[PDB]
mmCIF file of C-alpha atoms in Angstrom:
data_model
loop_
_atom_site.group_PDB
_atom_site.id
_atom_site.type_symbol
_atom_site.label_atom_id
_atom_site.label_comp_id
_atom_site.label_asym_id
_atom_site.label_seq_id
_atom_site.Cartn_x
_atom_site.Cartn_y
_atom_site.Cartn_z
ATOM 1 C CA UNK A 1 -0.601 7.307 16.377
ATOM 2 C CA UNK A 2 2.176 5.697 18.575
ATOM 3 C CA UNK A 3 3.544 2.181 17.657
ATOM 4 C CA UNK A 4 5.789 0.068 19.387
ATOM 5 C CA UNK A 5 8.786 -1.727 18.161
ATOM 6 C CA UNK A 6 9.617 -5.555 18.610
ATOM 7 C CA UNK A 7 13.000 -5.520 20.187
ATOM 8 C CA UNK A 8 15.227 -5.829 17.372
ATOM 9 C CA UNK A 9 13.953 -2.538 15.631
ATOM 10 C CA UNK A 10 13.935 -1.096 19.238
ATOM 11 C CA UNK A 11 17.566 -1.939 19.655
ATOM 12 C CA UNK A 12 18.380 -0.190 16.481
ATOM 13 C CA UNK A 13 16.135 3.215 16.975
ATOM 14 C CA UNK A 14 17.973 3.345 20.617
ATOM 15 C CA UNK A 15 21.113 2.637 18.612
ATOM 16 C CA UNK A 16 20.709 6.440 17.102
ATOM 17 C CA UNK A 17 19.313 8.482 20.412
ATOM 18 C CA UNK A 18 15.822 7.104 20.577
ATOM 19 C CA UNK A 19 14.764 7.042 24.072
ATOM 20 C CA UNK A 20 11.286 5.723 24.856
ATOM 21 C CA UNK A 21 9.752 2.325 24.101
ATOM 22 C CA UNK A 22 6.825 3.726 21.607
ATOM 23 C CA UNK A 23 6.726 6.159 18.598
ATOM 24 C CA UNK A 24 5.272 8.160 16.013
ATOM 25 C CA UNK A 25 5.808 6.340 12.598
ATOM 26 C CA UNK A 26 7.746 10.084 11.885
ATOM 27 C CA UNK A 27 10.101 9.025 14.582
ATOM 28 C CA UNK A 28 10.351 5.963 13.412
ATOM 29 C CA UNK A 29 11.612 6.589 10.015
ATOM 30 C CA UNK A 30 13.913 9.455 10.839
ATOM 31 C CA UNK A 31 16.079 7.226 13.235
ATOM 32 C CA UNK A 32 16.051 4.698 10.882
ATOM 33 C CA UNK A 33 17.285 6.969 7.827
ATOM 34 C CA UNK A 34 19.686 8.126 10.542
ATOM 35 C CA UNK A 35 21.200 4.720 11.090
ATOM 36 C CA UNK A 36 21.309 4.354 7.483
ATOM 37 C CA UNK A 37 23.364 7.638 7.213
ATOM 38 C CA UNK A 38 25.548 7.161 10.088
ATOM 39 C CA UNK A 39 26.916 3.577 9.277
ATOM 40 C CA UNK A 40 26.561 4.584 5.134
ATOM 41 C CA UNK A 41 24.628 1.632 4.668
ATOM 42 C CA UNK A 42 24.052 3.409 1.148
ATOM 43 C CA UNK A 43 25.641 3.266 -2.041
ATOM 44 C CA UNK A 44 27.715 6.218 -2.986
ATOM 45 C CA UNK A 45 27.029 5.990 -6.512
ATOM 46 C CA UNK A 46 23.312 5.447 -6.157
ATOM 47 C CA UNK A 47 22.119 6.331 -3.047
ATOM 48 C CA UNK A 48 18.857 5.406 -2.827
ATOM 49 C CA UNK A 49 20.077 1.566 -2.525
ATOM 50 C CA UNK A 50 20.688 0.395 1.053
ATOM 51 C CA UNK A 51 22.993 -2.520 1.251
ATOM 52 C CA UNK A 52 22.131 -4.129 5.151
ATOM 53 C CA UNK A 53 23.688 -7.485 4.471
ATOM 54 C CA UNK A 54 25.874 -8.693 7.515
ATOM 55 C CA UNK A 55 24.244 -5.683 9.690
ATOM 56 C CA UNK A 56 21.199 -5.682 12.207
ATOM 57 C CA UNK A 57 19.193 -3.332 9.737
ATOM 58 C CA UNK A 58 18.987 -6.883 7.504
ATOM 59 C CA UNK A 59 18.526 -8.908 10.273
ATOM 60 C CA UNK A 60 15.231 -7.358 10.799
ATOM 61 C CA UNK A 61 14.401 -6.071 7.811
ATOM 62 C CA UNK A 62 14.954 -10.041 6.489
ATOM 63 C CA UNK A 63 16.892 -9.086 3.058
ATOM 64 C CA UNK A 64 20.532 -7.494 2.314
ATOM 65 C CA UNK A 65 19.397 -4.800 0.067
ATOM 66 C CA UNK A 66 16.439 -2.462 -1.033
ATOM 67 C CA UNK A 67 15.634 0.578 -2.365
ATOM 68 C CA UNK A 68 14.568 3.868 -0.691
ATOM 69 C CA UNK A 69 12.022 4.240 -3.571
ATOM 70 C CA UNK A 70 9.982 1.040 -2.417
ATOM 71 C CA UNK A 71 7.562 2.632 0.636
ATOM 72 C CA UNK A 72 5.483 -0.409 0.464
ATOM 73 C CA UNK A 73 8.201 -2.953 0.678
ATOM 74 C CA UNK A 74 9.786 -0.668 3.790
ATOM 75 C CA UNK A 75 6.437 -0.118 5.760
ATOM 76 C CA UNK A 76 4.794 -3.925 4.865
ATOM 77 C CA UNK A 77 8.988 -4.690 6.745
ATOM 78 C CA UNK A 78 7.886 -2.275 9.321
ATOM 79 C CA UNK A 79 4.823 -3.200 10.074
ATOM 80 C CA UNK A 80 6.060 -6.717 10.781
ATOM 81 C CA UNK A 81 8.730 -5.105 13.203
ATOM 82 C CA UNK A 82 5.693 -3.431 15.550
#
């Protein structure tokens, strides 16, 4: 199943070596946990918080923070990026 990203998630996948213009939702996730890990959007002390305030991973997401253990929250904010 291949989706395709509004731009402002497509800027961001492309951001991290993303290529194309559609994706698996695999593909998908792994660039974004890569942009996550590259900038350390994470908290050191407990990693499974993001903090995105101020960064283009809040702009679309539409909030500062979440939690890695919240898969509905992150696909119902993907979803709305496709």
């Amino acid at each position: 199943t291949l989706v395709r990203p509004k731009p402002l998630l497509l800027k961001l996948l492309k951001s991290v070596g993303a290529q194309k213009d559609t994706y698996t939702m695999k593909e998908v996730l792994f660039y974004l946990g890569q942009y996550i890990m590259t900038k350390r959007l994470y908290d050191e002390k407990q990693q499974h918080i993001v903090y995105c305030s101020n960064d283009l991973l809040g702009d679309l997401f539409g909030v500062p923070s979440f939690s890695v253990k919240e898969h509905r929250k992150i696909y119902t904010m993907i979803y709305r990026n496709l």
